[PDB]
């Protein structure tokens, strides 16, 4: 009912349920894989959505909105997906003439019109984005935020005269996804390129951002940015008149990130007292709680607290003053801790006498006293350090989850020990399923290749692939995955 009753290590999954619900982030729903986002949760989405929008306007990306529905034949104009499509069949009691499908992505919808908007080089680059929801009916069991059947996302689609233009933006968007996670969610991600076997069917290459849940040792795709080259341009006959009057195919990118990011954050920073929010995604930065008992204290406290509130708010630091008389101080402590509020300020008699108050960080529970005069400044610096600390703890933790090894058995040791592994690899696609099905022999417990990180350690000259025996091309991250 109230309090988290499962240790994050002991039942991590029951923990997650308890946290997301009891923190007022979500509510479950009578349709599997769909979840209600209460304001505490949606606020987080809005914050990142603001950030991302800001950043893509600088790349002249423009928002837009395409329809939620797509027709059978249009949709089937990408591979291995059709069993995941939800079909609208009727309206009221009337069967529709043809099935129509709910968007799982907007490629087919959008790219059918592109040729119409793109006749010449003067038309390029074309840069669109959507904030919409999409629907995929997925076999693997749904889990709030991480794998949802409906989900909010942003989906970006661009088209350019040439690769230099296009690829450059791919990596531009990838960095924005890093910042999304690091500057806002304080979640560290590793940028990489996916393997041929795991990359997006219609992409030249898929660049990715990868996170890792230490507790169950599962990696997770945090965001995705593709160079598509001309693949879709061939499929939808999207062409332009060159600066010389030769017809050309366009070079496109698509990229997207979803509410999954919210789940990643929760899993990262959440603890046994409950939700822990980086301040940049919590409406309330501070909760002010009075702690006193003699009735004589009552007016003078209500004031001191109301004063402290005034200071913060003036400074555009939103906060709550829990002054409710029918709740124990410990109720209030637990409650706001659980809800993720970064800072509690405690006000009692010893602080009025002393012109001060106790501040307490949500991230690690250090308390201090600070003279009222300098509360504003100390609160601001605190909030920053809480971000600094949440992030840095999470990067120390990520790094300890990554073991660099060279042999197959070193690999299995690491995998058995809930790690993810950095290993030399030849990159032959034929090895991927072998490696998957054969590790799974010792949610799916196979070792997937996650991403070939951009930041490569050096490659010894004779270094062999840990599986093929073939000489290894580059270091790749492998792990069990969400
Ligand atoms: N069911 C889902 N719920 C929430 N987010 C999702 C879901 N499926 C994919 N994503 C995210 O969507 C982004 C874009 O990738 P996309 O190509 O749409 O999905 P995917 O690669 O098919 N799924 P996965 O195997 O789970 O990473 C990725 O960063 C995924 O993390
Ligand atoms: O959705 C994608 C590719 C990209 N589209 C928008 C930007 C980011 C995103 O990775 C991969 N994908 C994922 N799931 C799908 C599910 C179905 Br059903 C279909 Cl038809 C198609 C797809 C499908 O194409
Ligand atoms: Na994943």
Domain positions in the chain: 1-278, 279-384, 402-481
Residues with CB under 5 A from ligand 3 (ion): 220-221, 481-482
Ligand nearest to the CA of 260: 1
Q: Does the CB atom of residue 223 touch ligand 1 within 6 A?
A: yes
Q: How far is the CA of 9 from the centre of ligand 2 (A)?
A: 33
Q: Does the CB atom of residue 148 touch ligand 1 within 6 A?
A: yes
Taking the CA atoms of residue 20, residue 23, residue 25 and residue 28 in that order, the dihedral angle to the nearest 10 degrees is 50
Nearest Cα to 231, choosing from 137, 166, 311? 166
Q: Give the C-alpha separation, 80 to 255, whole Å.
A: 20
Atom of ligand 1 nearest to the CA of 222: 29
Q: Give the C-alpha separation, 200 to 37, whole Å.
A: 29
Resolution (A): 2.9
- 316 in helix, strand or coil? coil
Residue 150 has φ and ψ, to the nearest 5°, of -110, 140
439 annotated as a binding-site residue: no
- According to the entry, how was the structure determined? X-ray
Q: Does the CB atom of residue 105 touch ligand 2 within 6 A?
A: yes
Nearest Cα to 347, choosing from 315, 370, 326, 366? 370
CATH class of 402-481: alpha beta
Range 1-278 classified under CATH 3.30.930.10: yes
CA-closest residue to ligand 2 atom 12: 105
Q: Does the CB atom of residue 111 touch ligand 1 within 6 A?
A: no
226 annotated as a binding-site residue: yes
Count of C-beta atoms within a 10 Å radius of residue 364: 12
Q: Does the CB atom of residue 207 touch ligand 1 within 6 A?
A: no
Inter-axis angle of helices 260-269 and 39-57, nearest 10? 120
Q: Does the CB atom of residue 224 touch ligand 2 within 6 A?
A: yes
CA-closest residue to ligand 2 atom 2: 105
Q: Residue 421 has which token pair? A: 């592994």
Atom of ligand 1 nearest to the CA of 138: 1
> Would you put residue 14 in left (φ > 0), alpha (ψ -120 to 50) or beta?
alpha
Q: Give the C-alpha separation, 420 to 482, whole Å.
A: 13
Q: Give the C-alpha separation, 480 to 482, whole Å.
A: 7
Q: Residue 392 has which token pair? A: 């840095």
Nearest Cα to 236, choosing from 51, 101, 109, 349? 109
CATH, domain range 279-384: 3.40.50.800
Q: Does the CB atom of residue 138 touch ligand 1 within 6 A?
A: yes
Which parts of 367-443 are beta strand (E)? 367-371, 402-404, 420-425
Q: Give the C-alpha separation, 60 to 463, whole Å.
A: 44
Q: Give the C-alpha separation, 103 to 153, whole Å.
A: 12
User: Beta strand 26-27 with 36-37: parallel, antiparallel or unpaired?
Assistant: antiparallel
Q: How far is the CA of 105 from the centre of ligand 2 (A)?
A: 5
Nearest Cα to 115, choosing from 10, 248, 8, 18? 248
């Amino acid at each position: 009912i109230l309090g988290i009753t499962s240790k994050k290590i002991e039942n991590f999954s029951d923990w997650y349920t308890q946290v997301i619900v009891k923190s007022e982030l979500i509510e479950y729903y009578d349709i599997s894989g769909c979840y209600i986002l209460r304001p505490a949760a949606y606020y987080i989405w809005e914050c990142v959505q603001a950030f991302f929008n800001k950043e893509i306007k600088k790349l002249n990306v423009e928002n837009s909105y395409f329809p939620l529905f797509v027709t059978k034949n249009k949709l089937e104009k990408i591979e291995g997906f059709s069993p995941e499509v939800a079909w609208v069949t009727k309206y009221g009691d009337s069967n529709l003439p043809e099935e129509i499908a709910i968007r799982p992505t907007s490629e087919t919808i959008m790219y059918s019109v592109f040729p119409k908007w793109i006749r010449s080089y003067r038309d390029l680059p074309l840069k669109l984005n959507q904030w919409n929801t999409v629907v995929r009916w997925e076999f693997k069991q749904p889990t709030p935020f991480i794998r949802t059947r409906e989900f909010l996302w942003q989906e970006g689609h661009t088209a350019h005269k040439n690769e230099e233009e296009a690829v450059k933006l791919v990596f531009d968007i990838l960095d924005l996804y890093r910042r999304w996670y690091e500057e806002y969610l304080a979640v560290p991600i590793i940028k990489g390129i996916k393997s041929e076997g795991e990359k997006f069917g219609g992409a030249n290459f898929t660049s990715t951002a990868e996170a890792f849940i230490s507790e169950n040792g599962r990696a997770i795709q945090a965001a995705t940015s593709h160079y598509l080259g001309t693949n879709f341009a061939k499929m939808f006959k999207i062409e332009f008149e060159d600066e010389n009057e030769v017809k050309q195919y366009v070079h496109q990118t698509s990229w997207g990130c979803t509410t999954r990011s919210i789940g990643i954050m929760i899993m990262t920073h959440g603890d046994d007292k409950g939700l822990v929010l980086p301040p940049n995604v919590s409406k309330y930065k501070v909760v002010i709680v009075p702690i006193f008992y003699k009735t004589t204290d009552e007016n003078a406290i209500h004031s001191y607290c109301k004063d402290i509130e005034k200071i913060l708010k003036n400074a555009q630091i939103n906060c709550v003053y829990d002054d409710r008389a029918s709740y124990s101080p410990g109720y209030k402590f637990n409650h706001w801790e659980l809800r993720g509020i970064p800072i509690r300020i405690e006000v009692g008699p010893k602080d009025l006498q002393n012109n001060s108050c106790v501040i307490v960080r949500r991230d690690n529970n250090e308390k201090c006293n600070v003279k009222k005069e300098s509360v504003l400044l100390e609160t601001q610096q605190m909030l920053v350090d809480i971000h600094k600390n949440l992030f840095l703890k999470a990067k120390k933790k990520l790094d300890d989850s990554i073991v660099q090894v060279t042999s197959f058995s070193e690999v299995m040791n690491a995998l058995n020990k809930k790690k993810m592994v950095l290993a030399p690899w030849c990159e032959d696609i034929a090895t991927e399923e072998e490696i998957k099905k054969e590790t799974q022999r010792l949610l799916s417990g196979a070792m997937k290749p996650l991403c070939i990180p951009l930041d490569q350690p050096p490659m010894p000259p004779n270094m062999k692939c840990f599986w093929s025996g073939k000489p290894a091309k580059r270091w790749c991250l492998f792990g069990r995955s969400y």
